[model samples]
Target: TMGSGRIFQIPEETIKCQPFECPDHFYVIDAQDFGWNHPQAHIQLWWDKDADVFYLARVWKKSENTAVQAWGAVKSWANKIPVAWPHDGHQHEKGGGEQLKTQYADAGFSMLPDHATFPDGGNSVESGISELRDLMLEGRFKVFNTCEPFFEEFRLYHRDENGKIVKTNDDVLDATRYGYMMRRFARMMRDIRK
Candidate 1:
């Protein structure tokens, strides 16, 4: 946790779990000699829940040009979607989360938080996924035909009934979870409407 010198150290680890990634992934788009930005990034879908209002908004990591183009391709992406990003946004000076955020800001995006270590502590991943299922059953979470990578991941997402990763390929699925993570409050806001 070094977001702008927000210092912290971990003395131990509790709870064990497996690591997940799409594939052939490592280093951001800026890493020297390794900078490709492939796997670009994950953007969540807001579910008010479905009816063309919700989908993980599939993102594919192809070329360097996609680094910026991906944001534009997503029609669902808006200035007020409430960006909920995962880790790598914590290292301010060393890891470049700050600079990435600056780029995000430069690109007209605003939001924060490294998922694993939720400083504010919101919804748990399991419960959020459950809610996602609930929304889907009601046709609130929508996935477009073009969101191939997302669908591919979903098809491969054979997590156990308890939400444990069974096949372990979640790069895109996590993107949807990130959406739900940020959208939870918006859904909360919906509480007043009904």
Candidate 2:
């Protein structure tokens, strides 16, 4: 059984859910950039703050695409969504003075002021994985059925025999966890429009 070392204990039946009609609020947005070889993944998670449930409304895995192309894809779905990027976003772009996150901010995206961190202030992958697993088991986490690719990767996400993460198919999964960890930075949909 995958329960032994699986990071996510989500039940198989619960993996697919009815798509969100329209979210009242969006909790963090996360984007992962892969310079080349790997596909860039972008995810937007909607939060029903009142119910404390999350609905993953969007997922993207763009391979063989430029940064410009990736940004364009995100912009189409991210209008009024606040983005919470990973730490690499804080690094300066190659031979460029501007940080990767800064470049995205300059392009008019509503980016949070800092790179993503958990509400407790730590950014450890293991800590975030632990928290996400708890949410999944508790029924607070959900993914849209239309995000077929996300599910594809979720099933393949696992740990090695030594207990280390395999890390082979986790871009979409990483994007979701990044969004979850940065949930505090998310803004209400109505607030962002203002």
Candidate 3:
């Protein structure tokens, strides 16, 4: 779900991914948070059986930490969960074929498959903004009450008059947008989202 600049239709079925169960539920990592200076985090999600909304079970942000350290800590907990990142991960490809994602793969994170459309289909944005905003309004999107920064970013996230997506401190939101993709995308797109 790269969730980057692409438009998404957001199927009702897709939004119904909550209450399912972990390892079978959803997990995502925004590509925007991997670089230097950007806060890196792993967002764990859960569905409320009583509520239709998804819950942010946990958000681990390792500010000023090395990628390896961040990965090590997350890997211990998210061992098998797939991490869907933005196109930036692939964009970091080196001449020898080393990219930011490659480092994660080499280090042992299960990267989610890349897809052109939604894991199911798309119409998708920079991190699926259109779909995400719409979902949030409908109570389909939600965060744990304890996620202070997550709520902060949710309130602060917005586009400018020129239509430029602001990039202040939404590492958590960025990580969040990739959730749907990780949940719906096929295991392997053969290096794409097949």
Candidate 4:
């Protein structure tokens, strides 16, 4: 029996076909690394403070040399975009003696000083999902029509009959949610005159 509920309630209207240019403004990056076993997802998001819209700028997934490849991709997109990463980014479990974020930081990427969390300092999975869902319903979140990889994950993002999320191939979605959760930490590219 299939699960009766969908974890992510994405509307068709949210997927749009349009051109996007990186305007001079604040932006945040989110990423999930799986090393050699799985692909790493790095997503770029632009928050329009005035319009209160979250713009999905780019979606990337790659495997093997994950950290190096992630840095390469970010450089190609735009250097200096602050990235909000998972709490595990600060762990030493897999690292010889260094943290995951430290590994990435050595490559010149602007890694956030701390793990990603809600502006209120909460880190509940359900809370993050709820906020993301609300944004979708309110038409405040959008994705580029060309982000097929992201949409592919979206389609498979659901719960099992046991009411637990089937954790497979959800790299993009994971990264996207991290971005939204820590968007308040986004940094400005062009200085605004006060």
Q: Residues 1-194, candidate 2: write the lDDT tens digits.
A: 34337666576567568885655454545555343577667788888888888888888897777656667877877766777777643334452213656766766566677667787778888888887777777887888888887888778777877788777778887778778878887777667553
- Cα-based lDDT for every prediction: 0.43, 0.71, 0.53, 0.71
RMSD of each: 14.1, 3.3, 8.5, 3.2
lDDT of 4 at 157: 78
TM-score for each prediction?
A: 0.51, 0.84, 0.64, 0.85
Model 1, range 1-194, lDDT digits (tens) per residue? Answer: 11222111111111111223212211111110002343544554434333334544335433474325545654233434445555544334554544554455455554443332233676466666676666555555555555566555554555455535452445566656665555543322223222
For model 3, give the RMSD to the true fold: 8.5
Q: Is candidate 2 or candidate 3 better by TM-score?
A: 2
TM-score of candidate 4 to 2 decimals:
0.85
Model 4, span 58-79: residue lDDT tens: 8888777657767777676636
Kindly list the per-residue Cα lDDT of model 3 for residues 16-101, writing each as its tens digit: 33233333323332222465566776666553333445555556776777657767777654555566666532443652213655
State candidate 2's TM-score: 0.84
C-alpha lDDT of residue 177 in model 1: 67
Sort all candidates by TM-score, best to worst. 4, 2, 3, 1
Better of 1 and 3 by TM-score: 3
Error of 2 at 156 (Å): 1.0
